[PDB]
Design a protein around this ligand. Sequence first.
Ligand SMILES: OC[C@H]1O[C@H](O[C@H]2[C@H](O)[C@@H](O)[C@H](OCCCCCCC3CCCCC3)O[C@@H]2CO)[C@H](O)[C@@H](O)[C@@H]1O
Ligand SMILES: *[B]([O])([O])[C][N]C(=O)[C]([C][C]C1=[C][C]=C([O])[C]=[C]1)[N]C(=O)N1[C][C]N([C][C])C(=O)C1=O
Length: 265
Amino acid sequence: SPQPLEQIKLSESQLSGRVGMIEMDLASGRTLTAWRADERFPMMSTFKVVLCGAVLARVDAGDEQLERKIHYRQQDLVDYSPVSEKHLADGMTVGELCAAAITMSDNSAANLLLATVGGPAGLTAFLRQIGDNVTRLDRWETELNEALPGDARDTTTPASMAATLRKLLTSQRLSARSQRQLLQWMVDDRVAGPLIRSVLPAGWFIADKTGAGERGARGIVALLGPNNKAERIVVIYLRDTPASMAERNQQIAGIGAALIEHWQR
Ligand SMILES: OC[C@H]1O[C@H](O[C@H]2[C@H](O)[C@@H](O)[C@H](OCCCCCCC3CCCCC3)O[C@@H]2CO)[C@H](O)[C@@H](O)[C@@H]1O
Ligand SMILES: *[B]([O])([O])[C][N]C(=O)[C]([C][C]C1=[C][C]=C([O])[C]=[C]1)[N]C(=O)N1[C][C]N([C][C])C(=O)C1=O
């Protein structure tokens, strides 16, 4: 494979789409590879990790419990809710809702959790509290995926999302147990995790959350590294491409291949 930046450029040309990428050391925060890292991209379902960071912050403060069971209704549901649809009779705990939101991208679980943190405005305020002055959530699932050209709603930048993920996972803003819970949810992703493992060389750690929207919008936030370690945060977003889902997946995978083959920096 080409050098990472050369592959990123190639992916843009082939997608006739815009790619945003950062690769960041998890321990120190050093930025290593960056491409359009200050440009805005729809977060799509990648926001669900930040959401559950805010939920965990409430748990740490004693204003929420992961055990607390929410008995929601059918009128609360939006599309792509495979876990929450199974529990109208019996409900789900707040912890189960975060697991469903992160590991199965469950949209109704995400909306239920979003209300508990003050809606899109509440989650945006949490972002400002942790020093992210860029990322913004404006809408609920599933409208937040609309990815209209030029629309700043529901966007982040690769650089902001990577810094925010590092803050949530490692900065001790969250308790030790909460940091470990957030990481474990990403480790347990079922949407893309197992597929990604199936194509990674032996020894490469993966934890992730993916996202998909309109107009070609597609993304992933991940922890990746050799020697079975979460060495780096890698954030890749695509937007404004007419390409097939299959190609968008392959192009992200190709950028990943370039990183794997050319990891020392
Ligand atoms: O020499 C390096 C490696 O070259 C190949 O590995 C290939 C692998 O066979 C292929 O499946 C993967 O595709 C890329 C899969 C990436 C998965 C998505 C990545 C995510 C992860 C977080 C960042 C965003 C994207 O590329 C690597 C590197 O060429 C060999 O198979 C392997 O034995 C060898 O160790
Ligand atoms: B996350 O990325 O925010 C969850 N994403 C969504 O719910 C996406 C669908 C993603 C998807 C792509 C391809 C598939 O085969 C299956 C699922 N939802 C949307 O993009 N939208 C956009 C806007 N409208 C809201 C009126 C939708 O109906 C919708 O679901």
